[PDB]
Amino acid sequence: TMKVINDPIHGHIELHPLLVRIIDTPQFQRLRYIKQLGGGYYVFPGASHNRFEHSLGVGYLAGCLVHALGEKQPELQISERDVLCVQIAGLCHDLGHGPFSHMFDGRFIPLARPEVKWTHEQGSVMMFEHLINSNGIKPVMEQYGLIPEEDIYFIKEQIVGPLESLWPYKGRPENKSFLYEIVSNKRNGIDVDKWDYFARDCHHLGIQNNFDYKRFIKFARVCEVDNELRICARDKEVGNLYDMFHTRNSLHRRAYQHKVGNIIDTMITDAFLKADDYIEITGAGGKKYRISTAIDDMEAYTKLTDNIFLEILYSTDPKLKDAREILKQIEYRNLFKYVGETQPTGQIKIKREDYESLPKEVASAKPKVLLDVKLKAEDFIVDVINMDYGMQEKNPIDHVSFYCKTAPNRAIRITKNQVSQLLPEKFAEQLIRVYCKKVDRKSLYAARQYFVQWCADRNFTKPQDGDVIAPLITPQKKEWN
Amino acid sequence: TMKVINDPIHGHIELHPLLVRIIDTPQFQRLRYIKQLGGGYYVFPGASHNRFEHSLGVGYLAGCLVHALGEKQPELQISERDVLCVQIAGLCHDLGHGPFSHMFDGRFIPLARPEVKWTHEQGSVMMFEHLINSNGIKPVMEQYGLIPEEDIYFIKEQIVGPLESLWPYKGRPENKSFLYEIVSNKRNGIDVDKWDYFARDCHHLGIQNNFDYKRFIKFARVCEVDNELRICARDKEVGNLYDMFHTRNSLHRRAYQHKVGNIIDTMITDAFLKADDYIEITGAGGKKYRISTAIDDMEAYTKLTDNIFLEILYSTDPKLKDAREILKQIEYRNLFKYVGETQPTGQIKIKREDYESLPKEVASAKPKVLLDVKLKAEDFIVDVINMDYGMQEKNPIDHVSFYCKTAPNRAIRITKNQVSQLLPEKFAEQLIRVYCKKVDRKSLYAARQYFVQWCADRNFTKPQDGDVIAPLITPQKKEWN
Amino acid sequence: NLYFQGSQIHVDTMKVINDPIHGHIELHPLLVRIIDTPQFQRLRYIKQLGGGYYVFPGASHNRFEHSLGVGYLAGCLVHALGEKQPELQISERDVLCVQIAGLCHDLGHGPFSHMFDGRFIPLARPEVKWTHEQGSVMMFEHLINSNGIKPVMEQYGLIPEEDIYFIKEQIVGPLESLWPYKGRPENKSFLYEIVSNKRNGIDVDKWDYFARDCHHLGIQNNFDYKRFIKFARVCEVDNELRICARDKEVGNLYDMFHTRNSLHRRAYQHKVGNIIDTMITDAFLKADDYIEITGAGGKKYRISTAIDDMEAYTKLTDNIFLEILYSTDPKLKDAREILKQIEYRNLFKYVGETQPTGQIKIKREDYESLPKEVASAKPKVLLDVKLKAEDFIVDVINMDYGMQEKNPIDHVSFYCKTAPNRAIRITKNQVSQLLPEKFAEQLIRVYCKKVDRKSLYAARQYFVQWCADRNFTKPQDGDVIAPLITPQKKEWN
Amino acid sequence: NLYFQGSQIHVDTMKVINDPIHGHIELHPLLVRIIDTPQFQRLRYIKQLGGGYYVFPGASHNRFEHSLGVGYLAGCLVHALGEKQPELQISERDVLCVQIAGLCHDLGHGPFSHMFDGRFIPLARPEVKWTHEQGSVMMFEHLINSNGIKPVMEQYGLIPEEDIYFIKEQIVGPLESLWPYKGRPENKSFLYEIVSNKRNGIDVDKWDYFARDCHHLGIQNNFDYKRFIKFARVCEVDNELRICARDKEVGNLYDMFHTRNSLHRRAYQHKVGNIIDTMITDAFLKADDYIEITGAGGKKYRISTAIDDMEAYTKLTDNIFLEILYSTDPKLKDAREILKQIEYRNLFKYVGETQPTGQIKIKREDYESLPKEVASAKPKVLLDVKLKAEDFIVDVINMDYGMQEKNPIDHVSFYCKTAPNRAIRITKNQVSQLLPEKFAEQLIRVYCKKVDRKSLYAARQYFVQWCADRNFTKPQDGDVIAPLITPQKKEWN
């Protein structure tokens, strides 16, 4: 039997029994113990929500979109099989997230295991495979009209993109291309994943969402673009699409890259790094794994959630003392201190290979200020944050197809010039934040002098509080006045 | 006694008895019969709200802001007298609006009376004067600690700006400069008027508001800028301020300049123009006025509201037949037809003196298309819409002062470069919309050919549906491909 | 231009409209056709809550947008039932007919909605028995005939004669005189329960106004209609196919009627809103001889007679208030003066409220006599003023769960998880002991038309004395407003 | 750096925090100091609604954010009263003390909130009498002492010994044994009514959870606390200064308790949520001998004994669920296995619900005997299975208006517009006949631990037979789940 579930965002949702079967497994239920916004909860007290409820919402919206397209255009031949496969991909897209979500694959794994290249999406494919195999899902799929081998493949492609390096997909053909655009849209980033998190994150954060996904659904059609049937938006809705990406950027700005939230994520990561040699997680065949190696074994990874934070915090093992001590500083709210923020000026980009060298640069600045303290490279954190419209330097709207009232089956393109002169001139930028691990008044004052001097030396933008935090430094640069 | 009133936007609000006294007059109650968004209601069925409830909200928020500043900074010496005067200005700012709000001073009066230069704000001063004088308000003001002559002057200045063409204000001195920034902020447009309408219009329209005025209040301080005490925002809130103006622009884009809403406003205006010789409104000393002359007599103007639409619609006078007939076409939904939209390309600006000449230009275009119909100048409407951040070409954030965490009493400035490269490169633009009054299939097809040809001739932007609506025209211009 | 299975694909793009309550709604072209008429557009000029706007400044909404929402929800419910139970053979014809009934249910409302058929017409024309629902049938008939709707109906698969009849029945109930309906048979009985549910009052009309009124009033709605839809099925009850709720949702259904009663209490029977409605009605009564409204064939009608001619009635909206307010005719001076007192907020003064005590009911035939009773009371208090019958207004308000003395849940059928096609009944005792023991009551409000402090003080003494004489309940503020009166009644102490 | 009247201006910028319910809240530095401790931060790891999250996927919220909201609202109410009535001489010291009590009221909650002191401790330690409120006092004492709070209190004008006492009294009620309080006198009685109102249950704790729980659950709140604040005054009642509501707000107060009862009904006593709480408790019981928690001086405690040591208790949160779930110790296998059944959604099965009929009350001393009664029933039905006492769970749920059998509105004082300083009482009969006639009741839920279809079918027969034998109410689905049983009882027909 279908179940009805009440979600605060979407209201009363129906879950097909096959979905219920997938949901009621250790692999899916695991997402109840992983916070959507990671350390954000320690800044936004409403942000208590977990990946579980987001995944349900994504599964639901994926079904909503596919159904709506099918009802409007029978000629697409969307089957209930297709609907289920998209719902399942929606449900399972986040299965590979680790403790504190983006903290894990964004901060911890790069530091704990530089030799690997890991993403939560790859994790999701592996965990999905593990969910299917450990819980006897294949016969249940068959029972509801799915073809497991083809459809499992299709689901994985929806999650992670083409699985092999020309129509690059095997699970569905070009005439159902639009099905790959629903859960995770690699072409332009317009997908139901965003739609759920905009609404859900806003509801919990206490920030109001200004994007209307239901309007989008109503104005969506499928049209022939090249040899594919693709989702197209109504032409006059282009402004709303630009606003959609604007909203994503505002949420990143206000909430997801919050300067304190990020420093909490940083501190948690430092603690995990201190604990990683001492915490054991039992995986397949009794083998032991670490926090950093649990990603190599889905049975161990199943048991790796936000609970690791509390295992550390409540530990008595002397070997965990350093890790424990960092988490206690989180609790006492003795956090690393924000120094400032700046950006590059020209066409200038900071390369990732250079990130590690930045704290030394800041330490090596020579502010012409008499200081009671001298600071070292290790005292500074330099966070380089890429802010963009989801496709690096590119305008996603250049990869959207539209239709017009007078010819609803004909796909067209719209350029930036055809829309508005008040839109962004660029679609990517970098923010550079600097923090100091020395928290006393005198270290902080010194840190600000080094930071502003560094901005001056590098021809970066003048920090907003520059004249206040470093009055002796800002005059030297008259690009700044 | 104070009254408590329940407003869906702000909840339970307290009204001081002096405010109640002002509210319970014919001059204020009049605002119950004027729609906030004018013709917008005929496109957005939730937009039934009137100026009355908006004015209450503006009065309330003005008090909220002033109170908050005063509680935080006693050194400002904000009195309850000051609070009342700002509330009253907030309440009374909209008293000068006419039938269908912006339709009246935006479309009707310019056409009905080209020789005058009229604004609703000027109207508000005159109506406020009339409210005070007709209802014995001055003694009531005295009773509550106001000084009528000075304070009435102060209120009018808050509404319309400096009354004489150096500190240009008389009602309050430089040390209370911040009081002029509350209701109608002529310096940068950050005021409580916007805050109420964002929230209220969104609530009724079915579009969600993404600006948080309460956060703004919490981060607001008053600091010395030159010799004035001015409102300053916290430095890191600059992004949110840019978003505030972004929200205003989105609302104008989606709702207030809706292409059909505007055409309904246009049609209502045409009807008023047809009726203007025949409708009589009795003013002071029994004198008769017209719709177009009621602005010269506050007693007549008091009786000029949205009711004029229904007076016309329900009239039987043969002399009102033409006017009545236009309104009936609104009811039957036989509206003028949208042809398209375009913009200028270069540094190019369309001057207001040239607006009237544009329909002739469109009619004089020579599309190389065989047409079954020929159209004249009078068949086209050309609407030129200025979209901007409230200060023409200027960036309002260049006229905002900020403070920093480390020095909260020190005002500073922040440039666009110091914020983000993803922000608008320009702050003003023009939209050009064209409509046709001939509604049959063949006229509309012809109208599109003339329109796109005109865009090509003028080097305007390619209409979004250009290739669809005029496939024979778009190839000639290879700036377009 | 495109083909599938060898046949040209036709793209029929529906109109989309954005409603703040229901979001983006699609309107079938037949609905659009009905909507874009003078008869329907008229509802833009009639406030949903009448005088309520003069108390709740958010309540600016008109009947127009409510009607759209009811039309939309009616379609939603019918669709959902049909999707879950194909065996019902709900057709798109049935869906359209229910949507149209939903849209058109309110066509007969007059100026300020319930003020008109609730207060004005009973006073202006005692000999007639008029209801807005009857008005809606007449206006619907007029809308159809004046706008050439019948061919358009045919074009979309409707059978005009049968279906027009069916729509009218949905609006007003059985039109005659055993299955009492002609538009649809017993196997589609559930279709009559969607727009206006005469059996138990569970319908989409309530669902829209709960959500819409709450949105505008600034009171939060606590009923969830979407949950209800999800738990609704059609089951055989007697020889009819009727809508049934899931058994465990019974608590929520009780709560639904609780919500309706709270909204009536807080908002629709607000003591000041009602007095504004009363004053507007008085003004209309003073204007009724002098205002002319042109109807069919140039005939003149009055405010009170416009209900006899749909062409005149089409032009009778909230505008009549402003026509009066802005008039210069000396003969309208009395009417005008009343409306000006509204603007200056010189309203009749609330005196108090009481209720009957026993199984005691105040009969409607006795309402008119109540102000004299109050005036004839003899309070043992030294007063500066003596008040007459004409100085008092006595408003008797029936508050109930929509079916007089009856529990609506006794007329609801339910189904159980284990046997979803079997209808059952649930009694009050099977649910909760914390529920109401009665389902109807009367509130008696008294007001005074003399507004000075002395008259008001006197009015309170007469009022509380009257409550004592009649063995009514002690007013909540009795000891404060009339300390010398309340001791005489020891049932009160 | 700046001066006014010749004295340097000091700028003390408060911390601002954004809460989705209350928006942007300012936190006094003393509050911040209390918040940023292990004892307070602990509340981040305890779900407000316990097992409710496993039914309502939005209910992910923890006690931490609720506590912040209660602290905030307590300050709001006290401030508002003081602004309107300076004569009360509410000081900023009083305000801080009430805020702190608000913040700290929930410090004593254990894993899954009401599951812990409601289900687990009674079962794990029958000899003790434990409440979360007592826990809160102990944890508050521990928070103060471990974090050097007393000097910080002094720094902001508090008198630690008196004020700490006062805070504890606000949390748990009178600490001893006539004015029963020591922290504040009778003229500040109203201060004890803010956080936890022992007299009638109208407090800010409810106001926060109504709004917060509704936000997360996906059920809309219909109570308006801000309206209440606007209509609240302090008046002399006996020799105390007490909070009084405006008279005409009585209906809204009844509605407030109606809302609380609906939330309990829909969400907090959800039949599946409760069974999840039951299963989690069973798992804790099987784990209790094997889990060690280190407390003061290295001493070891168990889940059931951690309440005896605040240092251990600090480390007892919802984490214990995952410790069990992820354990490999063979001795934890039984506990682990129960939690895995939760994950696989192999829950105990709901059988049905009934209530007592007369003035009949089931006594708590008899609860334990009920499963045997059910098992001893003799249904005249042919069954494949026989069930034992241990196969049944019988949950007896007390539903009431917060004061057992009593009407809380009988313990509320009101004021009237004309005499705002005079307290009065309003009886139920003075309000409405549509209100509850009783204010407390018992719901009896039965579940079966045997989950196969045959056992479930059998369980329903035993259950309905038991209801018949005990003259309980007929289950709502009785005729469907047990058609052969319901005819024997003609009180049911």
Ligand SMILES: Nc1ccn([C@H]2C[C@H](O)[C@@H](COP(=O)(O)OP(=O)(O)OP(=O)(O)O)O2)c(=O)n1
């Ligand atoms: N009055 C109620 C009852 C439940 N819920 C929520 C909790 C769940 O997210 C969803 C489904 O709850 P049900 O109680 O309807 O589901 P069950 O599975 O308990 O009922 P059954 O199995 O008997 O259908 O609705 C709700 O919002 N309001």
Ligand SMILES: Nc1ccn([C@H]2C[C@H](O)[C@@H](COP(=O)(O)OP(=O)(O)OP(=O)(O)O)O2)c(=O)n1
């Ligand atoms: N339960 C209620 C009652 C009223 N209102 C609204 C309508 C008004 O906008 C505001 C004030 O209503 P009151 O009924 O409190 O005001 P009155 O002026 O009628 O009461 P009184 O003069 O007796 O104080 O609150 C409300 O939201 N909820």
Ligand SMILES: Nc1ccn([C@H]2C[C@H](O)[C@@H](COP(=O)(O)OP(=O)(O)OP(=O)(O)O)O2)c(=O)n1
């Ligand atoms: N950005 C927008 C634009 C419009 N609307 C609302 C107003 C109407 O209630 C509904 C439909 O508006 P459209 O602008 O889509 O409809 P038109 O009829 O103007 O467009 P067209 O005829 O070109 O499809 O949506 C909205 O909510 N948001």
Ligand SMILES: [Mg+2]
């Ligand atoms: Mg269930």
Ligand SMILES: [Mg+2]
């Ligand atoms: Mg009043």
Ligand SMILES: [Mg+2]
């Ligand atoms: Mg259109």
Ligand SMILES: [Mg+2]
């Ligand atoms: Mg900070």
